Design a protein around this ligand. Structure first.
Ligand SMILES: CO[C@H]1O[C@H](CO)[C@@H](O)[C@H](O)[C@@H]1O
Ligand SMILES: CO[C@H]1O[C@H](CO)[C@@H](O)[C@H](O)[C@@H]1O
Ligand SMILES: CO[C@H]1O[C@H](CO)[C@@H](O)[C@H](O)[C@@H]1O
Ligand SMILES: [Ca+2]
Ligand SMILES: [Ca+2]
Ligand SMILES: [Ca+2]
Ligand SMILES: [Ca+2]
Ligand SMILES: [Ca+2]
Ligand SMILES: [Ca+2]
Ligand SMILES: [Ca+2]
Ligand SMILES: [Ca+2]
Ligand SMILES: [Ca+2]
Lengths: 151, 151, 150
C-alpha cells in the first residue's frame, strides 16, 4: 500500500516530465529542426564542403540527412526551403560510379532525382544535394552546401 | 519485494532524468529563448511579414507571441531587447476594426499599448508589434518584424 | 494491478531515456559541447565583456570557465568552429596581476600563451581563448565570441 503511494507519486512525476520534455522538444526544433517519425533533422545554418559536413554530423553523434521515404524527404525539404539553401545528403557513389549508397554501404531505398539526374557532370559528381523543390541532383563533393544532420 | 525493487530503480532513473533535463533546459533557452511561468518564448532570430511569421509558428506547433500578463510581456521584451528588433504579436483586428483578438478569436486579457495606440494609421494597421521598451503599436501586417513564437 | 502500473511506468521511463538522449545530441549541435558535468554553449555572436557576462548570468549560467585541460579542449572546439576567439569569465579587475573566477577564487588551471598575461597598455583585465586554445589577457571593451557554461 505504501508501494502504491510511491507508484502513484512516480507516475505523476514522470507525466510532468513527459509534458515538460514535449514542450522543450518543440522549442528545440524551432526554427532549425524538423521531426518526422522517430527521426530528427537539424540544420547547422551554414554551408560546408561534403567531407567537412559529414565530419560535423558524425562528431555530433548523428549523420548527414538521409531521407528514406517521401515523408522524410518532405520534412527535409521544409528546412532547405526555410534557409533557402540546397543541402548535402549523406549518400555518395564514390565506391562504384552510378551506384549511390548510404554511409553503411547499403543501396538507396528511396530517391528523388530531378529530371536528367544523376548525370555525373564533368565525370566527377559523387555527392548529392537536395534543392528547395525537394528534388535531388548529383554534385561535386567539394562544393559547399547547407549542413543538415539527422539524429 | 521485486515490485518494491522495481519502484526503487525507477525512482533513481527518474531522479537522473530530472537532474539532467534541468540543465538542458537552461542550455536550450540560451540565447534565443525565455521561460515565464509555464510558457516559453523562442525567437527565430530573423524578421518576416505577419502572415509568414504566423505560419512558421503554427507549423512548429506553437503560435506567435501572445503575452497575457505584464510578466509575460516583460519576458518577451527581454528577447526583443536582446535582438534589438521589434517583434510581431499574434493578435489582429483584421476581422472587426478596433477589436483585437487572439488567433482563437478571444478578446485581449492584457494590453500594453503606447499612448494613443492603436491608431489604425493610414486606415490599415491590423497587426501588433512590441517595441524594445515593451510597448505595443498597431502596425501594417505587411511590414517585416522579428519572429517570436510561444510554446 | 500494481505490477501492471509499474510495467507501464517502466515503459514510459525507458521511452524518456531514449528520447532524451536523442534530444541532447540535437540540442548540442552545432553550438554546444559537453565535458564531464559541464556544458559550454556559444551564442554564435560577439559582444564586449560586460554584455557577454550579463547574457550568461541572465540565462542562468556564467561565462566559460575552463578548469582543466579537458574543459579547455572542449571550449576550444567551439572557438575553432566559429573561428572566433572567445571571452572567459576570469578577470584581474580587482587586483592587477591576479586573475580570479567570478566568485573571487584564484585560478586552479591556466593555459596562457607565451608571455601572457602582459597587461598590454596597462589595461588588459579580461581573458580571451584563441583557436589554438591558448589564453591571452585582452581589454574588456573588445568584442569576442560569447560562450556560456551550464
Ligand atoms: C543543374 O545544373 C547543371 O550543372 C550542375 C553542376 O554545376 C549539375 O550537377 C547538373 O546535373 C546540371 O547539369
Ligand atoms: C512613428 O510611428 C507612427 O507611424 C507608425 C506607422 O509608420 C504608426 O503605426 C504609429 O502609430 C505612429 O503614427
Ligand atoms: C598581438 O598581440 C599583442 O597585442 C595584444 C593586443 O593589445 C595583446 O593582448 C598581446 O598580449 C600582445 O601584446
Ligand atoms: Ca565518380
Ligand atoms: Ca558519380
Ligand atoms: Ca548532376
Ligand atoms: Ca482594418
Ligand atoms: Ca486596425
Ligand atoms: Ca499605430
Ligand atoms: Ca587592471
Ligand atoms: Ca590586467
Ligand atoms: Ca595580453
Amino acid at each position: 500500500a505504501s508501494l502504491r503511494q510511491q507508484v502513484e507519486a512516480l507516475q505523476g512525476q514522470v507525466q510532468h516530465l513527459q509534458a515538460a520534455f514535449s514542450q522543450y522538444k518543440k522549442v528545440e526544433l524551432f526554427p532549425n529542426g524538423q521531426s518526422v517519425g522517430e527521426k530528427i533533422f537539424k540544420t547547422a545554418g551554414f554551408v560546408k564542403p561534403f567531407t567537412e559536413a559529414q565530419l560535423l554530423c558524425t562528431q555530433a553523434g548523428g549523420q548527414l540527412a538521409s531521407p528514406r521515404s517521401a515523408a522524410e524527404n518532405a520534412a527535409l525539404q521544409q528546412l532547405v526551403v526555410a534557409k533557402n539553401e540546397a543541402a548535402f545528403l549523406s549518400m555518395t557513389d564514390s565506391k562504384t560510379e552510378g551506384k549511390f549508397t548510404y554511409p553503411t554501404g547499403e543501396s538507396l531505398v528511396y530517391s528523388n532525382w530531378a529530371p536528367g539526374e544523376p548525370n555525373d557532370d564533368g565525370g566527377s559528381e559523387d555527392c548529392v544535394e537536395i534543392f528547395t523543390n525537394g528534388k535531388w541532383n548529383d554534385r561535386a563533393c567539394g562544393e559547399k552546401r547547407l549542413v543538415v544532420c539527422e539524429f
